[PDB]
């Protein structure tokens, strides 16, 4: 959260929050209702966002669901869809937080190491999250969808 970052900066310089930093947290406080609304529609439509995006991902690169792909078979495909749901709710946490610190901590540091240990292709993960972003944008208003899209963009960049 931006509140956390402001406290960290002031603590580093051993100063009480400057008036500008205090104004920053004031602005974020007022923005909170809008951010909560965006996260609320995401969680309300979590099932729909995950499902059609997953089908689009498998259609995009069918080698994943083909034999020899990491997600070959119903159980493997189910767990990958579970991962897509995981990342969506990570993005919801980031949206309410206002910064990407929660997303990074929960599911980014060592992203390549985790999924290559599993044998999963990280570019394919990127396409899956891209599909989630498109479906999420449809369920968001255009003004709101800019805010959520930024967190999605950070996540796909980190996937790569």
């Amino acid at each position: 959260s931006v509140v956390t970052k402001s406290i960290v900066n002031a603590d580093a310089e051993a100063r009480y929050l400057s008036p500008g930093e205090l104004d920053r947290i004031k602005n974020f406080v007022s923005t909170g209702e809008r951010r909560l609304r965006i996260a609320q529609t995401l969680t309300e439509n979590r099932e729909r966002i995950v499902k059609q995006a997953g089908d689009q991902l498998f259609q995009k690169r069918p080698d994943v669901v083909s034999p020899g792909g990491n997600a070959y078979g119903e159980e493997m495909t189910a767990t990958c869809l579970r991962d897509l749901d995981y990342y969506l709710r990570l993005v919801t946490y980031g949206i309410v937080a206002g910064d990407v610190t929660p997303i990074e901590e929960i599911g980014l540091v060592g992203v390549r190491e985790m999924y290559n240990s599993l044998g999963t292709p990280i570019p394919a993960v990127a396409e899956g999250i891209r599909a989630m972003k498109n479906v999420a944008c449809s369920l968001l208003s255009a003004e709101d969808a800019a805010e959520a899209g930024s967190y999605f963009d950070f996540v796909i960049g980190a996937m790569q």
């Binding site: 603590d11 580093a12 901590e105 540091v109 060592g110 190491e113």
Partner: protein, 66 residues
């Protein structure tokens, strides 16, 4: 007035292929002047401060400090 300290330094910033146990868990002798500055740095790093002892010096001495 060297302080003997025992501390941890878990790091989420990166995953380290090279040895990390040495930095992670350690005991060091920190002088009285340094201890506040080091305490703040390690506390900021978020590591748990397991133990503290006054290895050198006395618990209270008005003058004649090391």
């Amino acid at each position: 007035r060297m302080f003997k300290i025992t501390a941890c330094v878990p790091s989420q910033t990166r995953i380290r292929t090279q040895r990390e146990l040495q930095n992670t868990y350690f005991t060091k002798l920190v002088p009285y002047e340094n201890w506040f500055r080091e305490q703040q740095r390690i506390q900021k790093m978020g590591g748990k401060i397991v133990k503290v002892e006054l290895f050198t010096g006395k618990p209270g001495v008005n003058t004649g400090l090391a």
